[PDB]
Symmetry: D2
Subunit: 215 residues, 4 copies
Amino acid sequence: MKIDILDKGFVELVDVMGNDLSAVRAARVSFDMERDRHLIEYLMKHGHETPFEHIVFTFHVKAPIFVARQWFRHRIASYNELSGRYSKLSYEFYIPSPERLEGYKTTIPPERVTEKISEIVDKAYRTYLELIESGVPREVARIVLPLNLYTRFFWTVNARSLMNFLNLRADSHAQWEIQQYALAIARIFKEKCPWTFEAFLKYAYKGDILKEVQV
Amino acid sequence: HMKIDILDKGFVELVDVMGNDLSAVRAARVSFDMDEERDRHLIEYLMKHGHETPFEHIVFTFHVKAPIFVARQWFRHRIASYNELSGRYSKLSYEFYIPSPERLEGYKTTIPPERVTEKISEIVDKAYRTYLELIESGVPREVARIVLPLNLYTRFFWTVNARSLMNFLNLRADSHAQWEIQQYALAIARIFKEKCPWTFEAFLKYAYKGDIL
Amino acid sequence: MKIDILDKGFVELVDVMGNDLSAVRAARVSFDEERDRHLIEYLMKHGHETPFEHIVFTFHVKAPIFVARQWFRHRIASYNELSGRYSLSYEFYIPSPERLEGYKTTIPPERVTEKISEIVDKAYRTYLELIESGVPREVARIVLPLNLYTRFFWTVNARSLMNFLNLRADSHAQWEIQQYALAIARIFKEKCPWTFEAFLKYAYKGDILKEV
Amino acid sequence: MKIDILDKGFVELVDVMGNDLSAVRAARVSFKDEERDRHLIEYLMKHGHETPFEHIVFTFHVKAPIFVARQWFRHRIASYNELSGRYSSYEFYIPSPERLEGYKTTIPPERVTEKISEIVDKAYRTYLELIESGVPREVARIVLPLNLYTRFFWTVNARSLMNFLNLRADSHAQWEIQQYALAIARIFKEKCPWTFEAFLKYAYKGDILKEVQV
Ligand SMILES: Cc1cc2nc3c(=O)[nH]c(=O)nc-3n(C[C@H](O)[C@H](O)[C@H](O)COP(=O)(O)OP(=O)(O)OC[C@H]3OC(n4cnc5c(N)ncnc54)[C@H](O)[C@@H]3O)c2cc1C
Ligand SMILES: Cc1cc2nc3c(=O)[nH]c(=O)nc-3n(C[C@H](O)[C@H](O)[C@H](O)COP(=O)(O)OP(=O)(O)OC[C@H]3O[C@@H](n4cnc5c(N)ncnc54)[C@H](O)[C@@H]3O)c2cc1C
Ligand SMILES: Cc1cc2nc3c(=O)[nH]c(=O)nc-3n(C[C@H](O)[C@H](O)[C@H](O)COP(=O)(O)OP(=O)(O)OC[C@H]3O[C@@H](n4cnc5c(N)ncnc54)[C@H](O)[C@@H]3O)c2cc1C
Ligand SMILES: Cc1cc2nc3c(=O)[nH]c(=O)nc-3n(C[C@H](O)[C@H](O)[C@H](O)COP(=O)(O)OP(=O)(O)OC[C@H]3O[C@@H](n4cnc5c(N)ncnc54)[C@H](O)[C@@H]3O)c2cc1C
């Protein structure tokens, strides 16, 4: 599964451990213990979250650094990113489409706003090349590249933490760009753990957009 | 699907696994934006210089059955997930850990070791019979169970990743730890070895701190 | 500050880092009572709790082991229990007859209390008989019941502390742990009145704290 | 106490709970004898009993370049609170020619400083231009360089702080963040002198802290 985000980014599922039943098996130990589907619903509405920690995912994500920084703020998880110290950075930046500024009255037209951003990206990247070409160390030459540069990383997280992540990013208060990545994460989650997902929205989900956007 | 019996009535059973040795290689190799010969070499490299974040992408789920005094020690490992049987929600099964005579291999005692075994079974039986008694007299299960000894068996699920798993082994797979916990740590290591050959070997060679593996 | 719990336990404050204003400084990233207290309620009401992690406490607790097993399940915190390698005593929790109040039991509540005492004595004697006999404590102590008292140091921050109160300062929790949580709650109120106030009004998920 | 780092950054102490003895008291689970209490710190450190050191806590206020904060926020056992770029200054980290010392370059070291200052100025110009044009802050800021300075509060306990020093107060870490960990180390030394010495002697895995002073 690979979903395309923005103009050049993406969310891709690498691996998965367990499914809805993993949560059920884990919960049975307490009381010595169709019907299973009813237990998940029960857990969800009564606040028994731990059982869901036994479902785990690993995603491959390519996103603009300003999005990555917000994502990494989630501590209950594991990360592994491409290094800007040990690698030659590619010429890939997130250039917002004109429709992104729709809703805001601006002096200059959306195409103009979009034209300038690209321009600054070229001057920035061109300079980055002179320096690397001139013998400057990569780890120091990259401080000139803008926050709209694309980066890649792996993310391993369990169901319970993932639901905390959707509560916060698949919401209208979070930035538009990362909301797009949230929907992709939500979609994949629904495909792998449909019962848990349904119960989530119906009982514990605190955000707004997932109750108005299919999958 | 593996299972290993511990002590007289306990066990360690593997329920699931996510990934393998290459999971660590793929998570790491993504740093340089990038063959069998190379891959094993990479894992040892990471292990040598302490780059352990990549091994966090390997996960295990166990099902354990052990006495309460062992479980308590085990639960101190916070970087992991747990689900246990509730003593305040169901009737408790007459299953206690009774040490065998050999347990005293090295200690000379007033009375024969066989008698120590007999004595332990007695106080356990007496305590168990009082538990059933108070229960049938209408006493709340959560209250009646407080008379039960620490050798009563419990059960739980444990989901943990490879990095934390290696931390558990450095601490419990060691002679300084109690003999009962060692037995369980040995079982955890045999399963870890089975599923992650390269990683397990690299661990024993450039990082394992214990002394019984 | 020390509060006695049950028949021989307690919760005592050992140290504290910060107060309500610690959360205000963290949220504004820098360094008028009215202005600050309005922010604390603002953050509480919208779910922005990270600022409260910058407040921390360290308690010294003395509880029965079964109460301690539930308590230790709270992973986002620090613990240190007595082992007898640096600091051992032997006392047990014997419920009062009022504990069985409400339940209609076969024998008198006063007899339930007696039977618990009897077992404790027999279990305790057997234990000493084994030590004087030459069995190492690590083995001998496994015959001691779950109502055996222990002690530990607990260091936890405000965010996690409020999670602890949402689960233990509640009727679904066991009565014994409830008593310890009520104690934890009073001390918290004393050191962070504003934060405690806002907690009860917008985020407190339990029931018993609003009744006492 | 506050300490300057790089061309415009710093590390500032905001608060602290406990001292060396807070570990001693936690290890014994109690509450006097210096020779003894200090002897225990060393024992704990030598035999790996590190949980007692979790009972000492700090809060720092840091100002640093975004490419430094990113590497830093990587430490999960800790608490963070940064300034909002999409809601909440013309300050960027401009390397000195002495920073490119030891590297053979086709152009004068001073030219690098000038090449980097130029783009920073350009970018910043187009940014302030977009803001005034009506473009939302969260959008117009995507054109700013990774060397833009940010600020955050950091609360971490002594055990976790020792892990940070192991990895960052070391020659394998970028030179920039090495400077910050040195300041972190200095404050830590001042507040918990017994733990720091024991740490350096029995557990520290890095290199520079045994070479440089405080
Ligand atoms: C009435 C009652 C009955 C209970 N019955 C049982 C039972 O039968 N069996 C049983 O095993 N337990 C039982 N518990 C314990 C309960 O399941 C929790 O373990 C306990 O409340 C500690 O909570 P926590 O996980 O939220 O907190 P902490 O472990 O202290 O964590 C605080 C927060 O960080 C989180 N977190 C920490 N680690 C992880 C992680 N690895 N993955 C995802 N999120 C994480 C969550 O957001 C959490 O709320 C019971 C508790 C109560 C109050
Ligand atoms: C021989 C032996 C004797 C012992 N004696 C005692 C005793 O007298 N008293 C007692 O209370 N316990 C005792 N213990 C338990 C021990 O102190 C730890 O609680 C136990 O090993 C759990 O380990 P951990 O902290 O390494 O693991 P986890 O909790 O699973 O943590 C793994 C890693 O994450 C870390 N970490 C997690 N959370 C935090 C945090 N909040 N702050 C800083 N770092 C963190 C560290 O890098 C740690 O190694 C003993 C254990 C052994 C093996
Ligand atoms: C020279 C250098 C180069 C680096 N290069 C890269 C790179 O190319 N790509 C990249 O992505 N990162 C890179 N890093 C970051 C590195 O991978 C770690 O993320 C960083 O050092 C944070 O360390 P930590 O995990 O030890 O600490 P913390 O996250 O603060 O954790 C402290 C302790 O608790 C633990 N712990 C916490 N959470 C978990 C968990 N979920 N599972 C198991 N144990 C846990 C461990 O015992 C740990 O040491 C680099 C770091 C250095 C110093
Ligand atoms: C719309 C929006 C705006 C934001 N604005 C800002 C801003 O201006 N400044 C800023 O600094 N950040 C900001 N953030 C980041 C926010 O403050 C959190 O850091 C982020 O949401 C990560 O969430 P978390 O703590 O719930 O998750 P995780 O770090 O993944 O933790 C999950 C659970 O474990 C817990 N937990 C983990 N560690 C600890 C701990 N050490 N102590 C207590 N509990 C713990 C809690 O129960 C928590 O819910 C913003 C986030 C959103 C979604």
